[PDB]
């Protein structure tokens, strides 16, 4: 077809009320609206910065965006409070939308103490905002206690981006959002937080690996769940693991040399989310990240046609500065990409023809 690639800034540092914007999350509502979420950062810092979770909406497929609205408002005056690092998750079965994010007071990720009391200012809490009206209004919950089965887990935060809902197997319908936790020994591990009752209750699976960080999951053509993680041990590559269950546990973690990474967030999605199990279309994956091993630059999109075994196709979308990026499949068959060019947050839209591969006809 005719390749397509366009982009436009949704937030630029210093404009619209905040000196700094970071951390993208993107999704499509059941109605077809596009939602972009990110941090508004009064002091240009991660938690415990008194950050706010912001959102912009598009009702015309991404061409035009409405005004910036506040999902969770941070508090800059004592008692200081902050909300950061959003991740959207849409229950396609019920139409409910969730926005996961940090709730900080005195401590950030590294300084969080063990404990689960929402009133304790020394712990980094896990919050979830739920909307049943397409992202218009939100109800909030601190779920730290629900997702801390091991009293030794002293800190955690949802990986910003977008979570998933399983379509196949015995756990079809399950909502999965990835988190990074710090255990008693001080190791960074990955863990899936999930719900089998459409968001009523959330629970944690078994933690995996060491030297883990922000991580994402995708459902493969056979129902297996692939975990793709930032490596806090800085190997120069992404770490991967797979789950064959529900009541999540993953196998051993290994470095994937096909995916160079400078220790930064990335996104991995199903190109055809609705394809039947085992079909050719169900094996197609798209991955976005900074391909440079020395800096956050050279943003590229890679495509796999074999459940992530090989990535034969790749194209650079941003030769320069490029930190976090998230992908979502749009209703018109194209793909949305929210990323950080260094100036705030930018939205891009591309199609498969743009990726190229063969110089046909």
Curated annotation (Swiss-Prot):
The keyword Secreted applies. The keyword Cytoplasm does not apply. BNR repeats lie at residues 56-67, 129-140, 193-204, 241-252, 302-313. Substrate binds at residues 22, 230. Its main location: secreted. The active site is at 46 (proton acceptor), 214 (nucleophile), 324 (nucleophile). It is found in: Secreted. GO terms for biological process: ganglioside catabolic process; oligosaccharide catabolic process. One of its GO terms (cellular component) is membrane. It catalyses: Hydrolysis of alpha-(2->3)-, alpha-(2->6)-, alpha-(2->8)- glycosidic linkages of terminal sialic acid residues in oligosaccharides, glycoproteins, glycolipids, colominic acid and synthetic substrates. Induction: By N-acetylneuraminic acid, colominic acid, and sialic acid. One of its GO terms (molecular function) is exo-alpha-sialidase activity. Belongs to the glycosyl hydrolase 33 family. To release sialic acids for use as carbon and energy sources for this non-pathogenic bacterium while in pathogenic microorganisms, sialidases have been suggested to be pathogenic factors. This is Sialidase. It comes from Micromonospora viridifaciens. The lineage of its organism: Bacteria, Bacillati, Actinomycetota, Actinomycetes, Micromonosporales. The gene is nedA.
């Amino acid at each position: 077809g005719e390749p397509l690639y366009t982009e436009q800034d949704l937030a630029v540092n210093g404009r619209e009320g905040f000196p700094n914007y970071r951390i993208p999350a993107l999704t499509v509502t059941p109605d077809g609206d596009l939602l972009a979420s990110y941090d508004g950062r009064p002091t240009g810092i991660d938690a415990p910065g008194p950050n706010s979770i912001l959102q912009r909406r598009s009702t015309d497929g991404g061409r035009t965006w409405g005004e910036q609205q506040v999902v969770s408002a941070g508090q800059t005056t004592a008692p200081i409070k902050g909300f950061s690092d959003p991740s959207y998750l849409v229950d396609r079965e019920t139409g409910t939308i969730f926005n996961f994010h940090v709730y900080s007071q005195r401590q950030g990720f590294a300084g969080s103490r063990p404990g689960t009391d929402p009133a304790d200012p020394n712990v980094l809490h896990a919050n979830v905002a739920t909307s049943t009206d397409g992202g218009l209004t939100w109800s909030h919950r601190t779920i730290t206690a629900d997702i801390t089965p091991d009293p030794g887990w002293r800190s955690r935060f949802a990986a910003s981006g977008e979570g998933i809902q399983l379509r196949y197997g015995p756990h079809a319908g399950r909502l999965i959002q990835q988190y990074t936790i710090i255990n008693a020994a001080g190791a960074f591990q990955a863990v899936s937080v999930y719900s089998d009752d459409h968001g009523r209750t959330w629970r944690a699976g078994e933690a995996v690996g060491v030297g883990m960080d922000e991580n994402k999951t995708v459902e493969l053509s056979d129902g297996r769940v692939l975990l793709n993680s930032r490596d806090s041990a800085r190997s120069g590559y992404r770490k991967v693991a797979v789950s064959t269950d529900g009541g999540h546990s993953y196998g051993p973690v290994t470095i994937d040399r096909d995916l160079p990474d400078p220790t930064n967030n990335a996104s991995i999605i199903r190109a055809f989310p609705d394809a039947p199990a085992g079909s050719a279309r169900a094996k197609v994956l798209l991955f976005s990240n900074a391909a440079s091993q020395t800096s956050r630059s050279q943003g590229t999109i890679r495509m796999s046609c074999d459940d992530g075994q090989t990535w034969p196709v790749s194209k650079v979308f941003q030769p320069g500065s490029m930190s976090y990026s998230t992908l979502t499949a749009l209703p018109d068959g194209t793909y949305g990409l929210l990323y950080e060019p260094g100036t705030g947050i930018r939205y891009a839209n591309f199609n498969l023809a743009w990726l190229g591969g063969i110089c046909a006809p």
